[PDB]
Structures are given as structure tokens and as C-alpha cells.
């Protein structure tokens, strides 16, 4: 998406701005654009709440340091922002929820660093332990803002090959070229409005297929900043 030799821009949304480079190479999940839920009897006697106030802006998650041995990271949506800003209290005080996303991933490194990060989105990202029966904890199943680290990235902590994750809206980050990705994600469920707390419609993964390498003496940790922007986010109160 975004890489060297692209006119630097300054995208502003609400009370927030990010200096990101304009690169018309954005990933649009399953060839769809985030829209406003089709008429469903539930929001016919209870119109959907669409806070454009401090909910439609640019949320920046605490950067993550990338070292030679980092195994990967992941975030659950909407869980990640459930605890963040009005996007939290709004998604909580309102039973039902529905929203799409502009997901931006970005590295900062020298032209003497090297590494390859795969960035994909996976609907219904259920995980499994090492086992006897035992469903994963609540702290790793719904990590929130901080996210969680992958333990066995080869099977994606879900008994399924990483080698095949590109069958999903992915985006590569090859320091040697670009240094940032962008993904448009449309709401995906088996019902128009689900529960903003119980269910996580999808998971975001940032895995380093090609480890980070440099010659000692150069910054040993590469930052990986992730900015999130809700698109057409509605909420049903039912009152």
C-alpha cells in the first residue's frame, strides 16, 4: 500500500490527524465497502444510533516494539476499542452493535533494516490451547487494546497453517519497499446487529514471516503503530 516515493499526506478526522503517505494501494476486504445496515424489523420500531461525534475519528493504539525474536501479535474487534473512548461507553450502553473499519498498520525503520510482516484479517478468529479439554482464557480470547502475542504462529494458535492465511484480506509489509498497510473491513455476521461485548466479528493479525534483521548498533526494536477508524458504526438501544 504505502511505501517510499509517495507524496506525504495529512488525513484529519474529528479532533485527530495522522501524517500518513497517500498510497492508492488500499486493501478492500471481500470486495466490499462499509455501509449502513439494510432494513431489519428490529430497527423499525427502534432506529439505529449512529454516533458521528467522538466515535468517528482516528484511534491510535500503543505502538509495539518489534525485535528479532517477536512471534507476532493480534487484536480482537470490537473488543480492542470496547474499553477506548466513547466507542466503549457507546458500544456498551447500547445492546446491539454494527460497524466497518479502516485499519492502518505502519512500521518505522531505517533503510539498513530488513523484515517482512504479513497483515491479515480473519472473521471469527477462535483459538485453541495445547491440550485434554480446556477453552482458552478470557484474557487471551479478548485481549482488548494491548493485544496478545502469538505463541505458535506456524499454526496461528488455531491448528491452521499460517502458510495459507493469504486466503484472507492480507497486506504485506516489506521494509525493503513499502512500510505500511491499509485495510477496509465491511461488517460480517449472520445477523445485522450482534453483541458488542460477547462476540468478536474478526481478529487482526500482524505476523513477521521474515524475521527482523539488522547489524547491531542500529535500533534493535522497530515500532509497529496501528491506527483504527470506524466506518458507518451504528448501535441499537432497544428502548
Amino acid at each position: 500500500a504505502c511505501g517510499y516515493s509517495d507524496r506525504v499526506a495529512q488525513l484529519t478526522i474529528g479532533n485527530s490527524t495522522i501524517t500518513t503517505q497517500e498510497a492508492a494501494n488500499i486493501v478492500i476486504a471481500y470486495g466490499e465497502w462499509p455501509e449502513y445496515c439494510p432494513d431489519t424489523d428490529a430497527t423499525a420500531v427502534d432506529k439505529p444510533t449512529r454516533p458521528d461525534v467522538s466515535v468517528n475519528r482516528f484511534f491510535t493504539l500503543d505502538t509495539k516494539s518489534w525485535a528479532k525474536d517477536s512471534k507476532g501479535w493480534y487484536w480482537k474487534f470490537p473488543d480492542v476499542l470496547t474499553e477506548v473512548g466513547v466507542f466503549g461507553q457507546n458500544a456498551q450502553f447500547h445492546y446491539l452493535y454494527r460497524s466497518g473499519f479502516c485499519v492502518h498498520v505502519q512500521c518505522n525503520a531505517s533503510k539498513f533494516h530488513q523484515g517482512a510482516l504479513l497483515v491479515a484479517v480473519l472473521p471469527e478468529y477462535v483459538l485453541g490451547t495445547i491440550a485434554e479439554n480446556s477453552h482458552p482464557p478470557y484474557a487471551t480470547t479478548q485481549p482488548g487494546q494491548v493485544g496478545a502475542v502469538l505463541t505458535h504462529p506456524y499454526v496461528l494458535d488455531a491448528g491452521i497453517p499460517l502458510s495459507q492465511l493469504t486466503v484472507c484480506p492480507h497486506q504485506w509489509i516489506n521494509l525493503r519497499t513499502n512500510n505500511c498497510a491499509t485495510i477496509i473491513v465491511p461488517y460480517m455476521n449472520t445477523v445485522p446487529f450482534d453483541s458488542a461485548l460477547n462476540h468478536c466479528n474478526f481478529g487482526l493479525l500482524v505476523i513477521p514471516v521474515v524475521p527482523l534483521d539488522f547489524n547491531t548498533g542500529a535500533t534493535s526494536e522497530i515500532p509497529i503503530t496501528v491506527t483504527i477508524a470506524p466506518m458507518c458504526a451504528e448501535f441499537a438501544g432497544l428502548r
Binding site: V8, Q10, N15, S16, T17, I18, T19, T20, Q21, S54, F58, F59, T60, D62, T63, S65, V84, G85, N108, A109, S110, K111, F112, H113, Q145, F214, N215, G217, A218, T219, E221, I222, P223, T225, T227
Partner: protein, 134 residues
């Protein structure tokens, strides 16, 4: 130290918008992001980087722009004695969004120069000899 900060001392009231600029001077080989955040008048000072990201801010990748500008929306001063200022002003905070990154051969410590000034809607009234000299 600013021409503005000084010329205010020669007046009593004043109000308008200001624009603070930050210019990174490090080596052309370093990258990294800073989080410039404005905390409005009467507002609580950012607890940490995250609590400040929810307020009016600007992520500054100085790896892309060697300079960036913020604009204070509005401030007001109504000077009185008793000496106190009916100054309605916000605060500014610079946070390390990401760590400072540099390859081998470039200085591990860079500098930023801050500059401000009034915008076209800034005004002043009531002159009064300053207390800058002796």
C-alpha cells in the same frame, strides 16, 4: 522569548488563535512518531499517551514531515490586580508515540525547535508599559 509573548506585556486584554510549529532537525536517516496533544482550558492534563490520544491531537511522523503545525483554537486574557490572570488557556504535550529509530552511523539524539505566533483573529487592547525592563 517570542516576539508575541513580549508584545502582550505591552497590553492588557487579548484573544485569538495561535499556531505552534515543531521542526525536527535530526539526521535524514532517522524515523519515528511523536504524539502532539492539545489539552483545552480547564481540561485535565493527559495521564498518559493513551488518555491523550482520545483528545485533540496529531500523530507526527517526522520520518515523513520534518515540520508540523498545531493550532490552538482560542485563548483569552483579562488582566487584573490583587496580580492574577483570567487566562483561559490549554496545555500542549509531546509524547513518544514510537521509539526514536536510527540506523548505524546517525546521531542517537536529535532536536526539535518550537515556534509560535498569532493567527489573523488574534487581537489586543489597552496599552500599558511593560515590566520587562529595570
Amino acid at each position: 522569548s517570542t516576539i508575541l509573548g513580549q508584545l502582550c506585556r505591552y497590553y492588557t486584554q487579548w484573544s485569538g488563535s495561535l499556531e505552534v510549529t515543531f521542526m525536527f532537525a535530526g539526521s535524514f536517516m532517522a524515523t519515528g512518531k511523536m504524539l502532539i496533544a492539545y489539552t483545552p482550558p480547564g481540561g485535565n492534563v493527559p495521564a498518559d499517551r493513551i488518555t491523550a490520544m482520545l483528545g485533540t491531537h496529531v500523530i507526527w511522523d517526522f520520518g515523513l514531515q520534518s515540520s508540523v503545525t498545531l493550532v490552538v483554537p482560542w485563548i483569552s486574557n483579562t488582566h487584573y490586580r490583587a496580580y492574577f490572570d483570567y487566562y483561559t488557556t490549554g496545555i500542549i504535550t509531546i509524547w513518544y508515540q514510537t521509539n526514536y529509530v536510527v540506523p548505524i552511523g546517525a546521531p542517537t539524539t536529535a532536536y526539535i525547535v518550537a515556534l509560535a505566533a498569532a493567527q489573523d483573529n488574534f487581537t489586543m487592547k489597552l496599552c500599558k508599559d511593560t515590566e520587562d525592563i529595570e
